[PDB]
C-alpha cells in the first residue's frame, strides 16, 4: 500500500529535480546559494517552485504575477528565524527576503544515512518553499495581519 | 416595500471581509478617529434624502453602492452586497452595543460586537473558504425506529465527497443529547460531522430573573464529542400563536466560530419541515423517510448543483 505512495512521492521529487535541471544550472545546488551575487538564479528557482506547488494543488491556474522582487537579506537582524523566506508589501508591491546564511546552514547540517545526498538537499529546499507557498497562499487570498498571524503560527493550514 | 439601502466599501481597509450595520451614515463618530478603518463593508438605511446622497458622494475615501431590498431578508442583503462587490465569500457583521439597529432580519441572527473582531483567528481546518450545511435527524437520515438505519449507503460516500469539496458538516436536532450521541455511535458518524447539537428548543421566552453566567457541560469522554449545552433563549422575534423549532442561524454561527470559522462561502439548510427555513440561503425540503429509500443520489446532485449555481452567480 505505502509502496505506491512512496513511488508517487519519489515521482514528485523527480519532477522537482528535473524542473530544477531545466534551468541550466551546472553549479551544485549548494554552490548555487553559496554565490550571494547569483540572486537571479535563486529568485527564478523559488518562483518556479512556488508556481509548481500552486499548480500541483491548483492545476487550473498556470501563470502568476512574478512582479514580486527578491532581495537576499544577509543581515542577522533583517532575518526572521523560522521563516528564512518572507513576503512584504510595498504600497501594493510585494517583495521577497532570502536568508542565504540560514540556507547554507541548512544545506551543510547533516548527511543522514547509516546521488542521494542531492535528494536530501532537494527535499530540504522543497520543504522551505512549501512553507513559503503556504503563507503566501494565505496572503494572496487575504493577508494584512492574518498573514502576520500565519507567520506566528504556520499550523493553521494543518492538512 | 422596496427598502433602499446604501453600502460603502473602504479601498484601504485594515481588515477585509467584514460588515458593520449602522443606524445612519453619520455614525462614524462612534468609530471616531482612525478607528473606522477596521471594518470593510458599511450598510445603513436610506431615508430617501438626495441631500444625504450628495453628502455620501462627498466622501472620496470610500465607495458608493445603493440598492433596493423588497423584503427585510438577510439573504437579499447578502446577495445584493456580494453582487455589487463581486466578493465570493461573506465575512462577519457587527453592530454597536450602545446603538444597535433594530431591523427585523437581525433578530435570530448572530451579531458580533464591533471591537471584539480584532481578537480572532482564521484557523478553520480548511484549505480555503468552506460552505456550511446542517442535517435533520428524524425522517431525513435516521429512521424513527429504535434501531437507527441509514437512508442511503451513498450518504457516507457523499459526506466524504463533500469533505473533498470542504463543506462544513453539522448536525442539529431536538431529541435527547444522550440518545442522539448513541445514535451517532451506532451509525458510526464520529469522523464525519464537525458540530453535534440536539435539544434546540431551550428557548423559554426569558424576560426577567436576570439569570446568566451559568455554564456546565458534561462532556462524556466515551466519545470525546463536544456535549455543549445551548445556553441561548432568543426565540423572541415576532408575535405568533405557536412557536417552536427555533433553528436560528445565530446558534449555528456561534458554534462555527467555536472553531475559529469566520469566512464561509455559503450555507444550506437540510431539513424536512420548511418552518426551520426562516432566512437560510439554501433550503432542502427532504422527503420524510422513516424507512430506508436509498435515493440520496438525487438530493446529493441537487446539493452539488446548488453550490455550482452559487459559484457561477457570484464568481462569474
DSSP character string of chain A: -HHHHHHHHHHHHHHHHHHHHTT---S-HHHHHH-SS-HHHHHHHHHHHHHHHHHHH--S-----TT-EEE----TTT--TT-SEE---BTTB-EEEE-HHHHHHHHTS------HHHHHHHHHHHHHHHHHHHHHHHHHHH-SSHHHHHHH-GGGG--
- Residue B270 contacts residue B286 (beta carbons within 8 Å): yes
d(CA A125, CA A105): 12
A91: cell is 504600497
φ, ψ of residue B45 to 5 degrees: the values are -75, 145
Closest alpha carbon to A20 in A63, A68, A57, A52: A52
CA angle, residues B221, B224, B227, in degrees to nearest 5: 90
Q: Classify the phi-psi angles of B263: left when phi > 0, otherwise alpha if psi is within -120 to 50, otherwise beta.
A: beta
CA angle, residues A92, A98, A99, in degrees to nearest 5: 140
Contacts of B263 in chain A (CB under 8 A): 142
d(CA B229, CA B231): 6
Do the strands B282-285 and B168-172 form a parallel or antiparallel pair, or are they unpaired?
unpaired
d(CA A112, CA A125): 16
How deeply is A18 buried, as exposed, middle or buried, from its count of CB atoms within 10 A (0-12, 13-18, 19+)? exposed
Residues near A40 by beta carbon (within 8 Å), at least 6 away in sequence: none
d(CA A68, CA A89): 9
- Residue B286 contacts residue B136 (beta carbons within 8 Å): yes
Closest alpha carbon to B141 in B281, B278, B252, B294: B294
For residue A110, CA distances in Å to A9, A14, A27, A81, A121 come to 22, 22, 21, 19, 10
How deeply is A12 buried, as exposed, middle or buried, from its count of CB atoms within 10 A (0-12, 13-18, 19+)? middle
- Residue A111 contacts residue A120 (beta carbons within 8 Å): yes
User: B160 to chain A, minimum CA–CA distance in Å?
Assistant: 15
- Residue B286 contacts residue B303 (beta carbons within 8 Å): no
Closest alpha carbon to B74 in B98, B104, B99, B45: B104
For residue B290, CA distances in Å to A135, B5, B150, B155, B198 come to 48, 45, 10, 16, 19
CA angle, residues B158, B163, B169, in degrees to nearest 5: 85
B229: cell is 449545552
CA within 13 Å, CB half, A11:
7
Q: In what order do the strands lie in the sheet with A95-98?
A: A69-71, A95-98, A85-86
Q: In chain B, which residue's Cα lies nearest the Cα of A152?
A: B121
Q: Classify the phi-psi angles of A67: left when phi > 0, otherwise alpha if psi is within -120 to 50, otherwise beta.
A: alpha
For residue B86, CA distances in Å to B78, B79, B89 come to 11, 10, 9
d(CA B97, CA B113): 7
- Residue of B123, B125, B128 lying closest to A141 (CB–CB): B128
The resolution in Å comes to 4.3
Locate cell 547554507: which residue?
Answer: A104
Is the Cβ pair A159, B127 closer than 8 Å? yes
DSSP structure string for chain B:
--EEEEEEEBTT-SS-SEEEEESSGGGHHHH-SS-STT-SEEEEE--S-HHHHHHHHH-TTB--EEEEESS--HHHHHHHHHHHH--SSB-EEEE-SSS----GGGTTS--EETGGGGG-----SSSS---EEEE-SBTTTB-SSSS--BS-THHHHHHHHHHHHTPEEEEE--S-HHHHHHHHHHHT-TTT-SEEE----------SS-----------TTT-------------SS--S-------HHHHHHHHHTTT---BS-EEEEES-GGG-SS-SEEEEPPP-SS----HHHHHHHHHHHHHHHHHHHT-
Is the Cβ pair A159, B125 closer than 8 Å? yes
Locate cell 463533500: which residue?
Answer: B162
d(CA B68, CA B49): 15
Q: In chain B, which residue's Cα lies nearest the Cα of A149?
A: B121
d(CA B8, CA B14): 15
User: A49 to chain B, minimum CA–CA distance in Å?
Assistant: 19
Per CB distance under 8 Å, which residues of B are interface residues toward A?
14-17, 121-123, 125, 127-128, 263
- Residue of B15, B127, B263 lying closest to A144 (CB–CB): B15
Residues near B45 by beta carbon (within 8 Å), at least 6 away in sequence: B3, B5, B23, B24, B101
d(CA B222, CA B248): 29
CA within 13 Å, CB half, B74:
25
d(CA B102, CA B240): 19
Closest alpha carbon to B22 in B43, B53, B46: B43
Residues near B283 by beta carbon (within 8 Å), at least 6 away in sequence: B268, B269, B271, B274, B277
- Residue B271 contacts residue B247 (beta carbons within 8 Å): yes
CA angle, residues B131, B122, B192, in degrees to nearest 5: 45
φ, ψ of residue A128 to 5 degrees: the values are -55, -50
Beta bridge partners of A19: none
Amino acid at each position: 500500500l505505502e509502496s505506491y505512495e512512496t513511488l508517487k512521492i519519489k515521482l514528485a521529487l523527480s519532477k522537482y529535480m528535473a524542473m530544477l535541471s531545466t534551468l541550466e544550472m551546472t553549479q551544485p545546488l549548494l554552490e548555487i546559494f553559496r554565490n550571494k551575487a547569483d540572486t537571479r538564479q535563486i529568485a527564478a528557482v523559488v518562483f518556479s517552485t512556488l508556481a509548481f506547488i500552486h499548480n500541483r494543488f491548483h492545476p487550473l491556474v498556470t501563470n502568476f504575477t512574478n512582479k514580486m522582487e527578491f532581495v537576499v537579506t544577509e543581515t542577522n537582524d533583517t532575518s526572521i528565524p523560522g521563516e528564512p523566506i518572507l513576503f512584504t508589501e510595498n504600497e501594493g508591491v510585494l517583495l521577497c527576503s532570502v536568508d542565504r546564511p540560514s540556507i547554507v546552514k541548512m544545506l551543510s547540517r547533516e548527511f543522514d544515512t547509516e546521488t542521494e545526498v542531492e535528494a536530501t538537499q532537494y527535499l530540504t529546499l522543497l520543504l522551505t518553499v512549501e512553507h513559503a507557498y503556504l503563507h503566501y497562499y494565505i496572503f494572496k487570498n487575504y493577508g494584512v495581519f492574518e498573514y502576520c498571524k500565519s507567520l506566528t503560527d504556520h499550523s493553521l493550514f494543518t492538512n | 416595500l422596496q427598502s433602499k439601502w446604501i453600502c460603502l466599501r473602504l479601498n484601504d481597509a485594515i481588515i477585509k471581509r467584514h460588515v458593520l450595520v449602522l443606524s445612519e451614515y453619520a455614525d462614524l463618530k462612534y468609530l471616531g478617529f482612525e478607528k473606522y478603518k477596521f471594518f470593510e463593508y458599511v450598510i445603513f438605511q436610506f431615508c430617501n434624502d438626495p441631500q444625504l446622497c450628495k453628502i455620501i458622494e462627498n466622501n472620496y475615501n470610500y465607495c458608493m453602492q445603493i440598492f433596493k431590498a423588497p423584503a427585510d431578508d438577510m439573504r437579499d442583503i447578502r446577495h445584493n452586497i456580494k453582487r455589487a462587490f463581486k466578493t465570493p465569500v461573506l465575512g462577519h457583521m457587527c453592530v454597536l452595543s450602545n446603538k444597535p439597529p433594530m431591523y427585523s432580519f437581525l433578530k435570530e441572527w448572530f451579531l458580533l460586537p464591533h471591537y471584539k473582531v480584532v481578537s480572532l483567528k482564521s484557523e478553520s481546518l480548511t484549505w480555503g473558504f468552506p460552505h456550511v450545511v446542517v442535517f435533520d435527524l428524524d425522517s431525513t437520515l435516521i429512521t424513527e425506529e429504535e434501531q437507527v438505519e441509514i437512508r442511503d449507503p451513498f450518504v457516507y460516500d457523499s459526506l466524504q465527497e463533500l469533505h473533498e469539496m470542504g463543506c462544513v458538516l453539522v448536525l442539529w436536532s431536538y431529541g435527547s443529547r444522550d440518545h442522539v450521541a448513541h445514535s451517532m455511535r451506532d451509525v458510526d458518524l464520529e469522523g464525519y460531522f464537525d458540530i453535534i447539537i440536539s435539544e434546540g428548543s431551550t428557548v423559554q421566552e426569558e424576560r426577567s430573573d436576570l439569570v446568566q453566567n451559568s455554564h456546565n457541560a458534561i462532556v462524556d469522554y466515551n466519545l470525546k464529542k463536544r456535549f455543549i449545552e445551548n445556553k441561548f433563549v432568543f426565540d423572541i422575534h415576532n408575535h405568533r400563536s405557536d412557536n417552536n423549532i427555533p433553528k436560528s442561524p445565530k446558534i449555528v454561527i456561534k458554534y462555527l466560530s467555536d472553531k475559529n470559522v469566520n469566512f464561509f462561502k455559503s450555507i444550506t439548510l437540510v431539513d424536512d419541515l420548511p418552518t426551520n427555513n426562516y432566512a437560510y440561503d439554501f433550503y432542502v425540503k427532504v422527503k420524510r423517510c422513516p424507512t430506508p429509500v436509498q435515493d440520496w443520489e438525487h438530493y446529493h446532485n441537487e446539493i452539488i448543483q446548488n453550490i455550482m449555481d452559487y459559484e457561477q452567480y457570484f464568481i462569474k
